[PDB]
Ligand binder design. Structure first.
Ligand SMILES: CC(C)[C@@H]1NC(=O)[C@@H]2CCCN2C(=O)C/N=C(\N[C@H](C(=O)N[C@@H](Cc2ccccc2)C(=O)N[C@H](CC(=O)O)C2=N[C@H](C(=O)O)CS2)C(C)C)[C@H](C(C)C)NC1=O
Length: 253
């Protein structure tokens, strides 16, 4: 692995790693309370034998620049972070894969960037969502204070998340957890669109997902393919991420 830095539109430095390979160029986008270490820890990275893998830390996470404001965590800024990585590696074709909100980011990048040949969204769909202001603010308060890491650790432990997902939360600055949560009130609720006709769009979720309807909506509206894994909930589906990586490898091959 080599490390890289690029700058987003708003000047935020975005840091990541590049794992060279002779195959397709894949860009990996982590979830909110995560960083780029999850790709190796989940076994997803090992499941892609040939790809040139680019894994970024989104703003405010990992080794990327701090933000600390709700507006600085607007979805459009994350999209800019990812597009800056596409610029650095200069390819005409990329395949994006994102987990949870990272999947939503990947879908939005696909909508706006014609260099995205494929986008895979794990446990996030493409449809418009309702984002209640009170629930957002309550969650932001719960994650940003002294007890915020413990709150998330307990939440994910009680819901059966894999250990790497439980542990990643404590690596995120609490102020960035709060600001990222509040960032949802700046555009995150709009549906995503297909970027161009030849793009391959894939949604993945738990077969037991309590809200599969919007995943089927994306099949109809975007021509996305839906992949299911054996799990009762989206959080538990994260235990299957390496297995999903093997199926991604089959597409890239
Ligand atoms: C419940 C709580 C622990 C959890 N909060 C987090 O984890 C982090 C901590 C800081 C904020 N965090 C967010 O996530 C932002 N908060 C939310 N987002 C919503 C959501 O529904 N997301 C979906 C994916 C999705 C996205 C876009 C479009 C479709 C689907 C989802 O499946 N979420 C599961 C939780 C579960 O299955 O019950 C997880 N998502 C985390 C991640 O993205 O990394 C890993 S687990 C809407 C508004 C996007 C809600 C709510 C308060 C607004 N709170 C959560 O989700």
């Amino acid at each position: 692995r080599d490390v890289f830095e690029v700058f987003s539109r708003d000047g935020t430095p975005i840091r990541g790693f590049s794992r060279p390979g002779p195959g397709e160029t894949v860009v990996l986008v982590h979830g909110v309370a995560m960083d780029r270490r999850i790709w190796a820890e989940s076994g997803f990275l090992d499941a892609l034998p040939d790809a040139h893998v680019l894994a970024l830390d989104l703003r405010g996470r990992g080794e990327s620049g701090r933000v600390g404001t709700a507006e600085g965590h607007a979805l459009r800024r994350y999209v800019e972070d990812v597009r800056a990585v596409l610029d650095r590696f200069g390819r005409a074709r990329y395949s994006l894969f994102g987990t949870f909100f990272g999947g939503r980011i990947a879908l939005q990048v696909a909508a706006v960037d014609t260099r995205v040949a494929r986008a895979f969204s794990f446990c996030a769909h493409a449809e418009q969502v309702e984002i209640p202001e009170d629930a957002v603010e309550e969650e932001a308060v719960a994650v940003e204070g002294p007890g915020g890491h413990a709150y998330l650790r307990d939440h994910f432990t009680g819901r059966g998340a894999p250990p790497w997902m439980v542990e990643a939360c404590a690596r995120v600055d609490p102020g960035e957890l709060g600001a990222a949560t509040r960032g949802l009130l700046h555009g995150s609720d709009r549906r995503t669109e297909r970027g161009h006709p030849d793009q391959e769009l894939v949604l993945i979720t738990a077969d037991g997902d309590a809200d599969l309807a919007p995943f089927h909506a994306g099949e109809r509206r975007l021509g996305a393919h839906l992949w299911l894994v054996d799990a009762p909930t989206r959080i538990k589906a994260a235990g299957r991420l390496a297995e999903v990586g093997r199926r991604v490898a089959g597409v890239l091959a």
